Amino acid sequence: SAFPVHAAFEKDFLVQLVVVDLNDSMDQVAEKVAYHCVNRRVAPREGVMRVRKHRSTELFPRDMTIAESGLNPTEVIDVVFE
């Protein structure tokens, strides 16, 4: 059920390997990524974290799971604020 992706967090300097779960929501994925970013290289802020395919115009719904999203493992995503 382990699902590796590569994630870029808004205002960070890099892309990182973050292993999420096949059944995680786009709210949870955003948490697992943030853990490796906010308060490390990125200042914390108000707002709702969202997930999208890299540089996509389309945001995934917050409730949608990765399995339901159609993402393939090792694909690249961004975590951004509304």
Binding site: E10, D12, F13, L14, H36, A43
Partner: protein, 491 residues
């Protein structure tokens, strides 16, 4: 009396003949020779512009070494290791590890030309090139060797290339691509022309300026002497390029140069960039990394490239933007993940240094400065766990260096991906992806360190497992903050 070299030099390189007992192609196979179908007779017009001869070589090279070694001997007690800023010692560790055994590898590139180039002058100059790189490899093992007894990280002057440490893999992926992994003509263009008249001046002369400012004359004297050899054997590239152009292979030549320059750039950005703008003590920064780039690559190298009749690379504008940006991110990452390096990176963000950075790179503080603010706050609050990573960075499938972008106020990061033969690759730039696409058979089945981690080749699949996989043999060998965070006392 003796007769002047000009009177007999032509005979030293009158060595081409028409094979009869094997075919020309058997004797000079295209995979090793890279003659591109150009007939033997056309290669005889090759004229090395920086000539020497065997008796002159042994005499002159004898004198070069006598000085290099004499200086090292006379300065053993100068307290460089003991009194130098640790950022400077890490600069030495990085240099010797990243370079010594790659120099020895360069012998093979020169050897490839000495056996397989159809140009007689090239085969002779390549023979001196083999000798030169032998010199360079031996110097750069001999010099750091005395420091083994002081610091296990100096072991990496020898160990690095034998390891799977990420920077060593990035070095080997590059050198195996441009030096040891291709035909003689590709070596002439990618190594002797592109890398050796292009980039090495940055590390062997730009860094020497910083070394002299830091009062490390053993090192400055060493690397500047080494570059005098480079200046001679690098001149094998230009005449090969001229010959290709004259024989209808300009497009092929341009492509090789374009590829080699970008490949060298990304490696220099991760190793020399941080050295020049962060590890080197501020008072010893003769010029910024960008400034040296503009002197050596733009002002000197590119102008020479145009003079020979080639064009600015298609990615010119991307390259210029990259010079402003890339190494700042590479530095940040090398430091955050310092534990995977064999040197101790210095953060180099004291208020005084951040002012210098802002002056050299307007807008720095509103970008990278934003991440350093967070890092600094944590340090001042002893939240050290937030100053060490708990995952791996995503890595470029070409350069083998993590995927980065511009942080802070105007965040922007882009990965350039590619599906190919049922596999998904990720590249850190448009150019890196383009390089892969120029020669997929060279790269397609290579797996970067993180590919290996995900594929089960790194056991256990943990940060510790990865560190062991990278060849670290004791705790002391892994990178740490150069000043043990003492810099925070200035913030």
């Amino acid at each position: 009396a003796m007769h002047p070299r000009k009177d007999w030099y032509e005979l030293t390189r009158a060595t081409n003949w028409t094979p009869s007992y094997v075919t020309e192609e058997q004797l000079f196979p295209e995979r090793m020779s890279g003659h591109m179908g150009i007939p033997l007779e056309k290669w005889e017009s090759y004229d090395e512009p920086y000539k020497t001869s065997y008796p002159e070589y042994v005499s002159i090279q004898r004198e070069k070494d006598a000085g290099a070694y004499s200086v090292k001997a006379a300065l053993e007690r100068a307290k460089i290791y003991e009194n130098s800023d640790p950022g400077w010692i890490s600069t030495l560790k990085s240099h010797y590890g990243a370079i010594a055994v790659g120099e020895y590898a360069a012998v093979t590139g020169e050897g490839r030309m000495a056996r397989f180039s159809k140009a007689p002058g090239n085969r002779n100059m390549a023979t001196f090139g083999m000798m030169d790189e032998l010199r360079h490899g031996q110097l750069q093992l001999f010099f750091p060797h005395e420091y083994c007894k002081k610091d296990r990280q100096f072991d990496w002057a020898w160990r690095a290339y034998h390891s799977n440490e990420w920077a060593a893999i990035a070095a080997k992926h590059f050198f195996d691509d441009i030096i040891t992994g291709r035909d003689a003509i590709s070596v002439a263009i990618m190594l002797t022309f592109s890398f050796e008249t292009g980039f090495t001046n940055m590390q062997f002369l730009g860094l020497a300026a910083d070394a002299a400012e830091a009062g490390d004359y053993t090192f400055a004297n060493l690397i500047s002497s080494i570059q005098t050899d480079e200046s001679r054997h690098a001149q094998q590239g230009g005449p090969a390029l001229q010959l290709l152009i004259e024989n209808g292979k300009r497009e092929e030549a341009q492509k090789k140069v374009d590829m080699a320059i970008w490949r060298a750039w990304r490696l220099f950005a991760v190793l020399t960039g941080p050295v020049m703008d962060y590890y080197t003590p501020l008072e010893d920064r003769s010029q910024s990394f960008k400034e040296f780039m503009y002197e050596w690559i733009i002002g000197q190298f590119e102008r020479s490239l145009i003079d020979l009749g080639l064009d600015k690379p298609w990615y010119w504008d991307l390259f210029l933007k990259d010079i402003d940006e890339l190494h700042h991110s590479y530095h940040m990452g090398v430091w955050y993940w310092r534990t995977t390096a064999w040197w101790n990176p210095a953060a180099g963000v004291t208020p005084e240094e951040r002012d210098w950075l802002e002056e050299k790179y307007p807008g720095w503080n509103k970008r990278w400065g934003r991440c350093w603010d967070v890092i600094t706050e944590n340090v001042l609050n002893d939240r050290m766990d937030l100053v060490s990573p708990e995952t791996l960075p995503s890595v470029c499938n070409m350069s083998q260096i993590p995927l980065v972008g511009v942080p802070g106020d105007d965040w922007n990061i882009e990965v350039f991906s590619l599906e190919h033969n049922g596999r998904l690759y990720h590249f850190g730039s448009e150019v890196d992806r383009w390089v892969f696409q120029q020669d997929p058979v060279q790269y397609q089945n290579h797996m970067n360190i993180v590919d290996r981690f995900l594929a089960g080749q790194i056991q256990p699949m943990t940060l510790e497992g990865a560190l062991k996989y990278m060849g670290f043999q004791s705790i002391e060998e892994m990178g740490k903050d150069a000043h043990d965070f003492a810099w925070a006392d200035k913030c």
